[PDB]
Amino acid sequence: ARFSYLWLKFSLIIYSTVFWLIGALVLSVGIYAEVERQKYKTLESAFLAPAIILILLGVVMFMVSFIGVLASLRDNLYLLQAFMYILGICLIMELIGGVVALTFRNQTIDFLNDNIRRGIENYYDDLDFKNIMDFVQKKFKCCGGEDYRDWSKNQYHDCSAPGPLACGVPYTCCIRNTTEVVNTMCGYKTIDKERFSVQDVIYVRGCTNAVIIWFMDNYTIMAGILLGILLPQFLGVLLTLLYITRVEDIIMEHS
Amino acid sequence: QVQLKESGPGLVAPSQSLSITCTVSGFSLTGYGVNWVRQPPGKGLEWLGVIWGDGTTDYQSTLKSRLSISKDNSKSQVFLKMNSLQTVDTARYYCARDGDYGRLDYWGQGTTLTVSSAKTT
Amino acid sequence: QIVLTQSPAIMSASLGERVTMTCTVSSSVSSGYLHWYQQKSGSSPKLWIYSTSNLASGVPARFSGSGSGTSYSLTISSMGAEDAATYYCHQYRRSPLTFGAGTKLEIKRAD
Amino acid sequence: EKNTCQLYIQTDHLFFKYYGTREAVIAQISSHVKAIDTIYQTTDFSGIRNISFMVKRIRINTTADEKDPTNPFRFPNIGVEKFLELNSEQNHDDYCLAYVFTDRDFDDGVLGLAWVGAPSGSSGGICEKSKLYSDGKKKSLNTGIITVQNYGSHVPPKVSHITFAHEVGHNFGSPHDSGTECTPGESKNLGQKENGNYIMYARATSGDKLNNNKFSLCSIRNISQVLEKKRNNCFVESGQPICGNGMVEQGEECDCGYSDQCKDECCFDANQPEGRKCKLKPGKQCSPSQGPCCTAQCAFKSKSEKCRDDSDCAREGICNGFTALCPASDPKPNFTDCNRHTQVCINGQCAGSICEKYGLEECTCDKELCHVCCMKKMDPSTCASTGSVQWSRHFSGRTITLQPGSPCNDFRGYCDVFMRCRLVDADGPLARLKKAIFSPELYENI
Ligand SMILES: *[C@@H]1O[C@H](CO)[C@@H](O[C@@H]2O[C@H](CO)[C@@H](O[C@H]3O[C@H](CO)[C@@H](O)[C@H](O[C@H]4O[C@H](CO)[C@@H](O)[C@H](O)[C@@H]4O)[C@@H]3O)[C@H](O)[C@H]2NC(C)=O)[C@H](O)[C@H]1NC(C)=O
Ligand SMILES: *[C@@H]1O[C@H](CO)[C@@H](O[C@@H]2O[C@H](CO)[C@@H](O[C@H]3O[C@H](CO)[C@@H](O)[C@H](O)[C@@H]3O)[C@H](O)[C@H]2NC(C)=O)[C@H](O)[C@H]1NC(C)=O
Ligand SMILES: CC(C)CCC[C@@H](C)[C@H]1CC[C@H]2[C@@H]3CC=C4C[C@@H](OC(=O)CCC(=O)O)CC[C@]4(C)[C@H]3CC[C@]12C
Ligand SMILES: CC(C)CCC[C@@H](C)[C@H]1CC[C@H]2[C@@H]3CC=C4C[C@@H](OC(=O)CCC(=O)O)CC[C@]4(C)[C@H]3CC[C@]12C
Ligand SMILES: CNC(=O)[C@H](Cc1ccccc1)NC(=O)[C@H](CC(C)C)[C@H](CSc1cccs1)C(=O)NO
Ligand SMILES: *[C@@H]1O[C@H](CO)[C@@H](O)[C@H](O)[C@H]1NC(C)=O
Ligand SMILES: [Ca+2]
Ligand SMILES: [Zn+2]
């Protein structure tokens, strides 16, 4: 009985404080990204920015973990129960999100592509999304959201636009060997012509499909990522059950 | 074999309309054009007009106003209608098929056309 | 506008000779678009030569036409006794379909 | 009879119903033909280094055809086997291959079906003539079907013209891929698996992998036997004169298609006799398909009409009545501007920048880096821009902003809509944070 309180209390306190520090760090990074991006914001689009994603994730982690801290320390049954149910709610919410994606794959891919197209509308004004998009378009060998043609959404990459990049994919979609020099003009005059005519100059497949294809292709990595996302929360839930049992023993002995 | 035959009234009252039918057989009229060439008694061939495989027509410039050629692809019959034929209109009216390279390979027997206000005797 | 001038108008050739028939067009037309029909004074004009080099079906081989461009011709190796007919030179590459004036033929016999 | 296969592609009423217009159907069909030609031309089929395709009759069935009682393709429910059989029941001796494009769902979600070719024996495939076969009916087995929907969802065009390649490959004598060397999708090697399976796969590839558009070594070797035993039987020379495909070329004056293809009233269709087919009707001196300035009543337009609209180097272009083709555009004078004022025209196209219109050469070339830069031709003595006071007689004081997107500073930038240019490489907040931390920040901060 005595060995239960010390180890469970220290485990819950350490878990909650580590998640507190991680959430604070990621929320601060997201807030800094929001400030430095809204500095350069020019066009109003309903874009799910990476900075906004970081802010939301950080605030969720920070509040949940702070509830966990104020429970584990100060040893409050009310806050411990709130921490338990909040962590469990987050777990079941992530699970139902997974199952609803596995069900409505077609229009969740549609939603992802809509968000990616809105992002490439702010491609040149949101440098965070710019860097992430070029990194994906390089490593994953892809262009655009669902194809190379979604780059027509961007103002500088429209056939109606008068610039040199008029309906031409960026310099990251073009096929480029590692032992080669990058040319900006690689993707010029590409969107209008058919998919197969540009298979030998630029990457044609979208980056959403490329990402899902890689995840299916690297199921060890996908399993590792999903475990690292879910299992810590499950461990927190189970540890909270154990501390609930310990504190129940504590109140029984105190009475 | 492939044959063309023309049925004609023979006797035509002056300034009264004419109708000749060339009931073709052996070919699809949708892919062949049937011409209409008349011949005065002991004279040279004269061209009236044609109806093509798609129903288009192209008449002689001097007989455009009076000429009228129609056909029914399913019925396989070519119809030639003339209006207000004077005394000079008398001729032998042949229907011919526009074969390969415009050749008039297959012809019909033809109908003698007599225009005269006089009665029988 | 095209006019198919056929010369000479009246052919008088004795039996077994070689008689030629000339059709001259106003403007040059394709070689394969000109043809020849005979009319035996009371019969439908039957196709005789098409494309000016290929004979029709059921015809003698003595008929050998030729020509290209502005002048065309029809040649007979041996004048057959049944050849008494008006041979017509014809084209329909361009409107209007213009038949020749008709080069009539007669068998030059004893007076 | 060297390298080209003539296709007889037909579309059922559901294809038209989905695509709505004859223009959409013909555009999709030409896209499929172009995709399959691109697939086959690059694949060196051992014997031949180029095998092109050229559709000869694009026959499209309108929705109104559904009411026709003698048309058996109107049945909403029909088996894939039965569909392919009815495609083969028609006479197709005059075609290298004959395909039916449909938009109907098939049992088990199959994306189509073709007939397997063979080098010797086993009649069926490319260059196949009609023969009695069995069942008492003469079937032309140079036939294949394809559907653009499976499980009630329309198939995207990448997958559609990948399964078209699949069916023609089966017609070409290539069976379904087998073995680790020719099916890399199932290979446990990650490098090969990311490439994806080839076209000749029993299951339809997603079309998003590298090998999904290419023929395998197995399939290429199989196609080599068929293309060495039956190529010089029904193939045609590249660019051969074959009218009725809707493409005007040498040896013809105009093209319409077949009898039930076009409504043109001044050009002979294909069913017309030899010599007249695909030629202008006698009397109709021009065709709208021949040139863009021909009357709908098929006569040469007068001098009043102008073919083209306003151009960057010509006003309108006048053809009048002497030829169907509109002649070369009448160019605007030398040093005539084009889009914005960045370049000027010389020989019918505008290039060589703007500043030589009044005479000077463009400079290479903080907001003064984005509009236009040009100096007096005698070396960069004064590399000042257009609006600078040093040019007070040529550009007066007018400044010419570059196109939004045109790079500054060689090619490490890009002009925006605000006469400025940011670096194309960019830094980004998160990447700046990473570089500020991954660097030896212990001495970089203090
Ligand atoms: C687009 O619509 C067209 C109709 O508007 C379809 O064409 C139809 O095709 C069918 C068959 O493919 C055809 O039916 C008959 O056609 C022939 C008439 O004689 C006949 O030969 C056919 O087959 C018969 O022949 C053997 C000979 O021994 C018989 O023993 C058999 O009984 C066998 O059935 C068949 O009876 C229609 O006539 C034809 N319609 C027209 C107007 O041409 C296209 O198939 C359709 N295509 C697509 C892609 O939708
Ligand atoms: C035409 O395509 C055929 C594919 O169906 C192909 O047959 C396949 O050939 C491969 C070898 O090239 C066989 O693979 C076998 O051997 C390799 C050797 O490492 C391994 O992957 C396996 O042991 C495998 O068993 C396939 O099994 C074979 N498939 C079939 C159905 O026979 C033909 O070779 C092709 N034609 C030509 C002329 O090459
Ligand atoms: C992540 C978000 C969306 C989750 C939402 C759930 C919580 C914010 C709420 C919903 C229901 C609440 C619970 C409703 C009832 C109670 C019983 C209550 O019990 C007592 O007061 C006596 C028992 C004891 O000693 O704890 C303690 C708080 C608790 C668990 C509440 C804590 C806060 C909860 C879990
Ligand atoms: C990315 C991480 C944080 C997981 C969270 C995923 C969910 C927030 C996503 C994944 C699946 C998405 C859904 C996928 C499909 C639909 C159906 C869609 O409606 C239709 O398509 C209706 C018309 C039709 O039936 O076709 C509206 C959006 C919605 C609810 C999406 C809402 C957002 C969802 C639940
Ligand atoms: C999305 N749809 C599919 O993946 C179905 C699934 C399937 C596989 C095998 C058998 C039945 C169905 N495959 C196809 O549509 C194939 C066409 C695609 C792969 C291009 C189809 C398989 S039909 C058969 C012919 C002989 C035995 S089986 C095909 O190769 N025609 O030439
Ligand atoms: C423009 O100048 C070139 C000489 O470089 C000349 O050939 C051309 O004709 C000029 N353009 C016009 C429209 O005269
Ligand atoms: Ca053609
Ligand atoms: Zn197959």
Short mmCIF file of all heavy atoms in Angstrom, two decimals, chain C residues 33 92-95, chain D residues 275-276 279 282-283:
data_model
loop_
_atom_site.label_atom_id
_atom_site.label_comp_id
_atom_site.label_asym_id
_atom_site.label_seq_id
_atom_site.Cartn_x
_atom_site.Cartn_y
_atom_site.Cartn_z
N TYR C 33 -10.93 11.85 -112.80
CA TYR C 33 -12.28 12.37 -112.73
C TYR C 33 -12.97 12.47 -114.09
O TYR C 33 -14.16 12.81 -114.14
CB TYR C 33 -12.28 13.75 -112.06
CG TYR C 33 -12.42 13.69 -110.56
CD1 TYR C 33 -11.30 13.75 -109.74
CD2 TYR C 33 -13.66 13.55 -109.96
CE1 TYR C 33 -11.42 13.70 -108.36
CE2 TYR C 33 -13.79 13.50 -108.59
CZ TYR C 33 -12.67 13.57 -107.79
OH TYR C 33 -12.79 13.51 -106.43
N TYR C 92 -17.21 15.63 -113.34
CA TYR C 92 -17.98 16.23 -112.25
C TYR C 92 -17.09 16.54 -111.05
O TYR C 92 -17.56 16.51 -109.91
CB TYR C 92 -19.15 15.34 -111.83
CG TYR C 92 -20.23 16.07 -111.06
CD1 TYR C 92 -20.28 17.46 -111.05
CD2 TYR C 92 -21.17 15.38 -110.33
CE1 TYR C 92 -21.25 18.13 -110.35
CE2 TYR C 92 -22.16 16.05 -109.62
CZ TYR C 92 -22.19 17.42 -109.63
OH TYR C 92 -23.16 18.09 -108.93
N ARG C 93 -15.81 16.83 -111.28
CA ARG C 93 -14.96 17.28 -110.19
C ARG C 93 -15.38 18.67 -109.71
O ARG C 93 -15.34 18.95 -108.51
CB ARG C 93 -13.50 17.28 -110.62
CG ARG C 93 -12.51 17.06 -109.48
CD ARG C 93 -12.17 18.35 -108.75
NE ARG C 93 -11.05 18.18 -107.84
CZ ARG C 93 -11.14 17.67 -106.62
NH1 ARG C 93 -12.30 17.27 -106.13
NH2 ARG C 93 -10.05 17.56 -105.88
N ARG C 94 -15.78 19.54 -110.64
CA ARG C 94 -16.25 20.87 -110.31
C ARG C 94 -17.61 21.10 -110.96
O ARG C 94 -17.87 20.63 -112.07
CB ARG C 94 -15.26 21.95 -110.78
CG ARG C 94 -13.81 21.51 -110.75
CD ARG C 94 -12.90 22.62 -110.25
NE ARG C 94 -11.51 22.20 -110.17
CZ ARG C 94 -10.95 21.68 -109.09
NH1 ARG C 94 -11.62 21.52 -107.96
NH2 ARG C 94 -9.67 21.32 -109.13
N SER C 95 -18.47 21.84 -110.26
CA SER C 95 -19.78 22.15 -110.79
C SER C 95 -19.69 23.18 -111.90
O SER C 95 -18.82 24.06 -111.87
CB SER C 95 -20.68 22.67 -109.67
OG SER C 95 -21.62 23.62 -110.16
N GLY D 275 -12.73 8.58 -104.28
CA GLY D 275 -12.43 9.75 -105.07
C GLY D 275 -13.23 10.96 -104.63
O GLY D 275 -12.70 12.07 -104.56
N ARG D 276 -14.51 10.75 -104.32
CA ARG D 276 -15.34 11.81 -103.78
C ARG D 276 -15.24 11.92 -102.27
O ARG D 276 -15.40 13.02 -101.73
CB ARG D 276 -16.80 11.59 -104.16
CG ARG D 276 -17.10 11.77 -105.63
CD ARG D 276 -18.42 12.50 -105.82
NE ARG D 276 -18.57 13.05 -107.15
CZ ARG D 276 -17.91 14.11 -107.60
NH1 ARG D 276 -17.06 14.77 -106.83
NH2 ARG D 276 -18.12 14.53 -108.85
N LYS D 279 -13.79 14.99 -99.66
CA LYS D 279 -13.47 16.04 -100.61
C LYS D 279 -14.62 17.04 -100.64
O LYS D 279 -15.75 16.73 -100.28
CB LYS D 279 -13.22 15.49 -102.02
CG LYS D 279 -12.04 14.54 -102.13
CD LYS D 279 -10.85 15.23 -102.78
CE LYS D 279 -9.88 14.22 -103.37
NZ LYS D 279 -10.39 13.64 -104.64
N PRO D 282 -18.84 19.44 -105.31
CA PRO D 282 -18.70 20.28 -106.50
C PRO D 282 -19.61 21.50 -106.46
O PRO D 282 -20.84 21.37 -106.47
CB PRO D 282 -19.08 19.33 -107.65
CG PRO D 282 -18.88 17.96 -107.08
CD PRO D 282 -19.27 18.07 -105.64
N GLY D 283 -19.01 22.69 -106.42
CA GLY D 283 -19.77 23.92 -106.32
C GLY D 283 -19.48 24.66 -105.04
O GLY D 283 -19.36 25.89 -105.04
#
